[PDB]
Amino acid sequence: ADVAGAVIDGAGLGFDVLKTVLEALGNVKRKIAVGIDNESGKTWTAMNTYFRSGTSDIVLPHKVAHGKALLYNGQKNRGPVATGVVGVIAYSMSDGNTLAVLFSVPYDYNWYSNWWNVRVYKGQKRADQRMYEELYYHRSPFRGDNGWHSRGLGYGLKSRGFMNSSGHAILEIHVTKA
Numbered sequence: 001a002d003v004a005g006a007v008i009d010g011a012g013l014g015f016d017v018l019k020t021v022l023e024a025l026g027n028v029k030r031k032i033a034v035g036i037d038n039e040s041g042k043t044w045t046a047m048n049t050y051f052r053s054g055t056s057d058i059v060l061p062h063k064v065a066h067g068k069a070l071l072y073n074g075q076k077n078r079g080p081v082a083t084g085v086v087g088v089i090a091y092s093m094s095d096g097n098t099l100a101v102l103f104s105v106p107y108d109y110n111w112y113s114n115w116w117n118v119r120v121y122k123g124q125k126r127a128d129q130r131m132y133e134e135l136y137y138h139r140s141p142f143r144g145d146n147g148w149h150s151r152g153l154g155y156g157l158k159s160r161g162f163m164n165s166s167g168h169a170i171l172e173i174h175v176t177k178a
Ligand SMILES: C[N+](C)(C)CCOP(=O)(O)O
Pocket: 052, 053, 082, 083, 084, 085, 086, 104, 105, 106, 107, 108, 112
């Protein structure tokens, strides 16, 4: 089966492949499978993931051509620590701007919920705490509510994505030319 870390045909991205990626992480309380389909017309080059909470043992897929999707994952920090998997993925686009994707899969659903977001930043900006705070608090993230959400991104692009509500999370995003 396709694995986290791979770049696949973007038409092959879907819940089945992400479920498999999520299952392959085994028995961990909070974990996420992330798939982002690049149909933007331009190549993305990975910069970094800012992990606010949690970690990954997967290399952030380096080059993602138009027509390809990346597969990735993250998991809570090891041991009983009551924290989840929360972070921002940042890819450079060939126009000199940055594609940023927020994911948040909190430890405690009594206080918090799943959220995600997608935004293009002007210039080359590495993912960091400031970007996490902007995307989570101020830039209208979407709830992981087991439903799809669309939004135009500017820069000739639009996004359509889905995230479920539970702590074994899947996040599937398609970035297409608007
Ligand atoms: C809930 N949060 C997203 C604001 C902070 C991080 O959550 P957690 O990793 O402590 O659960």
